[PDB]
């Protein structure tokens, strides 16, 4: 099971993508833990899948951000409800498909980028990163093998899809 390889640890994907997204917004995330392995080709592919996902729903991401900012005290709980819902959203395939994985990291990276534009929100960036990583980590553990999904297959499909938008 390639998703069990320390090189492919979910934390790595989240940190890399979040860092990448923030930079795309003209900023330098100087509080991002390091990549104890360096950038991997799979992270490279995630950056693309995430970019394509965002562009496809740029308007909605903006509206989602606005609705989250409307919650009293701008609590982190509603964001967990978002994440949890995506994971528990029914299907006859993997509860944590490549699509949901990508959607969660793409939306999470977008939110991270916006939150960094506000000092008042920067503290909660640790929550965002940690929670997103731990949630996805658990769901892959109890879903990928059964529904025969893997990073190799992910890469196989990702390349072909990156080509269509290229």
């Amino acid at each position: 099971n390639d998703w069990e390889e320390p090189r492919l640890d979910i934390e790595g994907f989240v940190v890399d993508y979040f860092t990448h997204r923030i930079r795309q917004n003209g900023m330098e995330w100087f509080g991002a833990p390091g990549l104890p392995c360096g950038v991997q080709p799979e992270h490279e592919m995630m950056r693309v899948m995430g970019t394509i996902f965002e562009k496809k729903h740029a308007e909605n991401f903006e509206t989602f951000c606005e609705q989250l900012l409307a919650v009293p005290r701008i609590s982190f709980s509603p964001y967990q409800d978002v994440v949890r819902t995506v994971g528990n959203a029914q299907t006859d395939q993997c509860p944590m498909s490549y699509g949901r994985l990508i959607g969660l990291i793409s939306f999470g990276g977008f939110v991270a980028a916006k939150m960094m534009e506000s000092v008042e929100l920067q503290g909660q960036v640790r929550n965002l990163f940690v929670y997103t990583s731990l949630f996805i980590k658990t769901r892959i553990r109890n879903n990928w093998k059964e529904h025969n999904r893997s990073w190799d297959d992910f890469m196989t499909l990702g390349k072909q899809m990156k080509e269509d938008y290229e």
């Binding site: 996902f53 909605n60 989602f64 509603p78 819902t85 699509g99 990508i102």
Partner: peptide, 27 residues
Amino acid sequence: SSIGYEIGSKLAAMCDDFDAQMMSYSA
């Protein structure tokens, strides 16, 4: 909340469409 569920449901739908598009690649 109820806002998180709403957003979560739409993001779930967007994600499922993305996945379907990806699955159309065993070609």
